[PDB]
Enzyme design. Structure first.
Site, mmCIF file in Angstrom:
data_model
loop_
_atom_site.group_PDB
_atom_site.id
_atom_site.type_symbol
_atom_site.label_atom_id
_atom_site.label_comp_id
_atom_site.label_asym_id
_atom_site.label_seq_id
_atom_site.Cartn_x
_atom_site.Cartn_y
_atom_site.Cartn_z
ATOM 1 N N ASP A 1 0.930 -1.086 0.234
ATOM 2 C CA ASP A 1 0.077 -0.101 0.000
ATOM 3 C C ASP A 1 1.027 1.330 0.012
ATOM 4 O O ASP A 1 0.576 2.386 -0.481
ATOM 5 C CB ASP A 1 -1.110 -0.142 1.362
ATOM 6 C CG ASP A 1 -2.092 -1.061 1.100
ATOM 7 O OD1 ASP A 1 -2.916 -1.067 0.450
ATOM 8 O OD2 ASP A 1 -1.874 -2.154 1.934
ATOM 9 N N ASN B 1 1.608 -2.657 4.300
ATOM 10 C CA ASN B 1 0.903 -3.452 3.782
ATOM 11 C C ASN B 1 -0.400 -3.835 4.339
ATOM 12 O O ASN B 1 -0.359 -3.752 5.855
ATOM 13 C CB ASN B 1 1.563 -4.667 2.904
ATOM 14 C CG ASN B 1 0.696 -5.334 1.932
ATOM 15 O OD1 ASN B 1 0.059 -4.758 1.098
ATOM 16 N ND2 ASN B 1 0.817 -6.511 2.124
ATOM 17 N N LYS B 2 -1.366 -4.921 4.110
ATOM 18 C CA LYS B 2 -2.337 -5.635 4.915
ATOM 19 C C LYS B 2 -1.778 -6.008 6.276
ATOM 20 O O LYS B 2 -0.796 -6.594 6.231
ATOM 21 C CB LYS B 2 -3.104 -6.523 4.162
ATOM 22 C CG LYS B 2 -4.245 -7.192 4.971
ATOM 23 C CD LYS B 2 -5.384 -6.119 5.085
ATOM 24 C CE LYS B 2 -6.481 -6.621 5.932
ATOM 25 N NZ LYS B 2 -7.086 -7.978 5.694
#
Lengths: 274, 275
Positions: A185, A195-196
């Site tokens: 991201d 990121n996630k």
């Protein structure tokens, strides 16, 4: 901001599956709609306002920050639309070139473990299959919205062999994998990966078991100035079983656990290649 | 085997919230039941068969294996019954003593992070609160059965402050924690810890962030011969959406990520004290 612009912003905030790619595209459409709805007399102020709003949709996504920065404060609708469309074209081109470089990294016989849902990672995998490479994918369902199951349905549609697991089982499975490929991201100025939530855990597990960990990220996902320490990890209200559950959706992974970052310009080594 | 026994075996098999401890009790109940249905002459073989069936319920739980070796192969009804009741008495005593030692470990101001559900960890937490220690708990919902929410319901009952997170957020929160305390389904012969899938990840994150990681396991959870590399990790079928999901319920955590194992005999240091 015009009603139609607000609709698009709500559609963005509402998204639970589609990732940064889709979100950035919607952000661009928000500026296109603005130029199509407002009077050139109110455009400059409206643009600054929309810049602030698009980034607020998800401050963990560098793509939104770069989109906002790419859009000029102008009183001309045609220039505004042109810049928005140009950013989109650049995203599309970056993604297909990255997918090509990613598919090349994949070896026949690979067992790829990934996490969450990344349009870019999916294209890397689909391109590898198109090039007739044989491999299997291990992916997580990805709580709490299960965007991972979306990936599963896409891989299924493409006839790719895969196995789904729960997030908590990543340690047990990095071991069966020969390589890890996740999306991003944001890539911070100091080379860390946003990121996630949970990506950090997979990175730790894969390091202990000596599984090369790669991150796929177009350069428009690189933040030009934000360092790991100042990243804002977006959280979304989550209630299940009538119980409130904390839900910080994104995490940060140190570069020391990352082999390289696959970009449209080639595979880069963090943090020195920045 | 008798119908009553076979029914308890089923009841244990479909349980997914309560953990080791509870199963151990049902296992003992199975033997107590066996003593009321069979004649002395058929008791010995029945005990041999139940020994095997009880362990098959969940090969990942050492408590079942130790329960099986505790019950003697005898034709004496009164002996079978007496031994089963003694195992139960020992479990209860073990849990109480371990809780007292674990609570002692906790300090004012701690932010305890845990994973899955463990009645032992729960009693440690409750005993600490009962002794006026102030702390907060961070716990995971624990996919896919969410036994973690059962822990949350219990902590709420006790008036203990807690925060719930998803399993994938464990790395983001070890950071906020000052100490980690998880249970165990088995402590292998070489000192590794078998526990709910995901514990290993919690262990890795907490080590990276310098957060002491403790495991609470009564002595009857220590397996005397099984080594980490030979452990059987039980699995159940799982489906979400129209997708089949691999569901290995248990994992293995190396001892090098464990500060100590809290037992009813005191806190042991793996793997050296595990003999």
């Amino acid at each position: 901001l015009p009603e139609r612009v607000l609709e698009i912003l709500r559609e963005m905030k509402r998204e639970r599956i589609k990732g940064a790619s889709w979100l950035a595209k919607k952000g661009a459409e928000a500026f296109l709609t603005l130029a199509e709805e407002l009077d050139e007399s109110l455009l400059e102020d409206a643009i600054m306002e929309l810049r602030e709003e698009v980034v607020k949709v998800n401050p963990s996504m560098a793509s939104l920050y770069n989109l906002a920065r790419f859009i000029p404060v102008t009183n001309r609708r045609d220039i505004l639309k042109s810049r928005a469309l140009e950013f989109l074209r650049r995203m599309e081109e970056a993604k297909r070139e990255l997918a090509s470089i990613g598919a090349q990294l994949i070896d026949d016989g690979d067992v790829i473990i990934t996490h969450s849902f990344s349009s870019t990672v999916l294209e890397i995998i689909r391109t590898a299959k198109e090039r007739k490479k044989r491999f299997k994918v291990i992916l997580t369902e990805s709580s709490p919205d299960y965007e991972g199951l979306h990936l599963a349905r896409e891989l299924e549609f493409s006839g790719i062999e895969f196995e789904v697991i729960t997030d908590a089982q990543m340690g047990l499975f990095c071991r069966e994998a020969s390589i890890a490929i996740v999306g991003a991201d944001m890539i911070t100025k100091d080379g860390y990966v946003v990121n996630k939530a949970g990506t950090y855990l997979l990175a730790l597990a894969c390091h202990e078991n000596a599984i090369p960990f790669y991150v796929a990220a177009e350069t428009y996902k690189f933040h030009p100035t934000l360092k790991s320490g100042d990243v804002m990890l977006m959280e979304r209200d989550l209630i299940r079983g009538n119980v409130r559950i904390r839900n910080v959706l994104f995490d940060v992974t140190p570069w020391k656990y990352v082999r390289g970052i696959i970009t449209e310009l080639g595979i880069v080594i963090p943090p020195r290649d920045i």
